[PDB]
Subunit: 152 residues, 4 copies
C-alpha cells in the first residue's frame, strides 16, 4: 500500500544532504512550508523546531521542505537562507525541486499536497504513514509520532 | 520493566462514578491525574489537560482517572467540596478520593508512589505497569508522545 | 452620567485587608472583580486578569477589589475556604465577601446590581460612579481600552 | 513632535494626507517583513487594532523599514507579505536615504529597531514610542487613554 518517501530536492541549504538510507531506521517528519505563510511561520515551523530540540536524530529526523508554489521571484533560496537564520532554524532544510514551466515543485506535486503547511510522517521503514494539511494540534502530533516510534 | 510496579490506587470513595476496577483497566492505557482542587497548577493546567484527553481518546483505549490527594487544608478540600468542583468544572471522567491516613497530612496513594506534589501524572500501560510519573506542568506534545508510544507497544 | 449610580459594595467582611471606603477610593478608577472561588471562568480567566491589573497598574491610579459573591454551594465556599483560595492563588488585592441576604442564595451586592453571575466586572470612575458592568470573559485589550479611557477622563 | 512620515510609496492603499489623519489617534507599526518579533506578535496585534477599532477613531499604519537584507525585502516582496498575512491597514515604504542602510523615518525618530510602535494623539502630536513586545492590555490602556483625552 503505502509509498516510500522520496524527496526531490534542488538543494540542502544548511546541512549535508540526506539520502533515503540515511533516514531508514528513523521516524521522519517533513515539515513542508513556504516562508511567507502565516500558518507556517506562526505554527508549523515552531512546532518542528520544538520537535528537533526535544528528540534526538537517533529516533526522529526533522526535515524542512520549502516548497514554493506562488510568488517565486520573492521566495528565492537566498531569501530562505536569511529566513532560516533570522528565525533560528537548526534542522535541515531542503528546497523542493522546481519543475520547468510549472508553479508546483516536484515533491509537492508527487504527493499531492493541498498546500502549506503540510506535514509528512514516515516510518522507520521509510514509508509514508501520514500526510496532514493545516494546523496540527501539539497533542495530536505527539500521539502520532509516539505511535510510529514504538510500533514493531 | 520486570520490576515496574503494578498500578494500584488506594481510594476512600469514588465521587462521580461507579468505581473502576483493575480488570476494567487492563488492555487500556491509564492516565491518572493527581490533583488538589485548590492548586492553581492543577486547575489551570493539569485538570484541563486530562479533560482534553478524555474527550479525544476513546475509553476503549485510554482511561482517565482523577485522583484527589489532599495534602493541605483538609477541612476545606473535602469530598463534598470536590463534588461541587467536578460539577462546576464539568469533569466527566471518574474521580477518586485518595485514602487518607490517620494523623498524617499525606494520603495513601501519594505516599506509596512517593509523589512530590500536585499536579502529578501517572501513566500505566495495558498491563498495568507504571511507566511514567511526572510532577508539574507537562507539555501537551510530550504527553502525546508518551501516550502514543504506550498505545502502540506490542 | 448624572443618572449613574455610585458604587456601593455591601460587605459582610474584608478577608485579607483593612476595609476600603468610597473616600479611600475617590480619585481612582475602581475595578471590582466579582467571583466565585470554584467557577472556572473566574479561576481560569477573571481572577488572573484582576491580578495582572493589580501587578501592572499602581494603586495611585487603579484600585482592584475582589468580591466573593457566592450564590450556590455556600457550605463549600465559606470565608475560611476563601482564605485558602487566596493564599494558594497568590491574590494580593483586597478581597471582600458580599453580604449574604437571609433566606436567599443571591447575596446583596449581586442582587443590587443585578449581576448575571460570575465572573463579572464592575468599573467605577474617579468620582466613584459605576460606568461598566460586564459578565463573562473580557479580552485583555478591551479591558485596557476601558480602563485607559476612564483614567484619562477630564 | 507632530507626526510626519517619509514615504517612498503606499503599497496597498491610496496615500494618507494629514486631512485623513486629523482628529484621530494613530498607531504606527514599524516593522520588517522577516523579523520574527514583528511577524509573531507585532503585526498580528496591529491587525487586531485595525479590526477592533474603527478607522474614524484609530488609524493603524504599517511602516516598512528595511535596514538590512534589502534586496530581499523589497516593495515587491512586501506586497506579497501583506497579501499572505492579509494585512488591510495602509502600509507605507520608509523613504530610503541614498547610500544609507537605515531609512528616513526610522532615522529621524531615532527608533531602536523592529518592531516599534509609535502612538500619536488626535492633534497629530507624537505621544509614545516603544520597542519590542507589548502586552495587549498595556496597549489597550495607552490607546484608551489617548482616545478619551481632552
Ligand atoms: Ca487499593
Ligand atoms: Cl530549530
Ligand atoms: Cl471531562
Ligand atoms: Cl494579586
Ligand atoms: Cl488587518
Ligand atoms: Cl535607506
Amino acid at each position: 500500500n503505502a509509498p516510500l518517501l522520496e524527496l526531490d530536492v534542488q538543494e540542502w541549504v544548511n546541512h549535508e544532504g540526506l539520502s533515503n538510507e540515511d533516514l531508514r531506521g528513523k521516524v521522519v517528519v517533513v515539515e513542508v512550508f513556504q516562508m511567507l505563510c502565516p500558518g507556517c511561520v506562526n505554527h508549523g515551523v515552531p512546532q518542528a523546531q520544538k520537535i528537533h530540540r526535544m528528540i534526538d536524530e537517533s529516533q526522529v529526523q526533522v526535515i524542512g521542505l520549502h516548497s514554493v508554489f506562488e510568488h517565486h521571484d520573492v521566495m528565492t533560496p537566498e531569501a530562505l537562507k536569511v529566513f532560516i537564520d533570522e528565525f533560528g532554524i537548526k534542522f535541515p532544510v531542503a528546497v523542493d525541486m522546481p519543475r520547468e514551466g510549472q508553479r508546483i515543485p516536484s515533491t509537492m506535486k508527487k504527493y499531492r499536497l493541498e498546500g502549506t503547511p503540510s506535514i509528512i510522517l514516515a516510518d522507520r521503514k521509510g514509508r509514508i504513514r501520514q500526510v496532514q494539511f493545516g494546523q496540527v494540534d501539539d497533542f495530536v502530533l505527539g500521539l502520532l509520532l509516539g505511535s510510529l516510534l514504538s510500533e514493531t
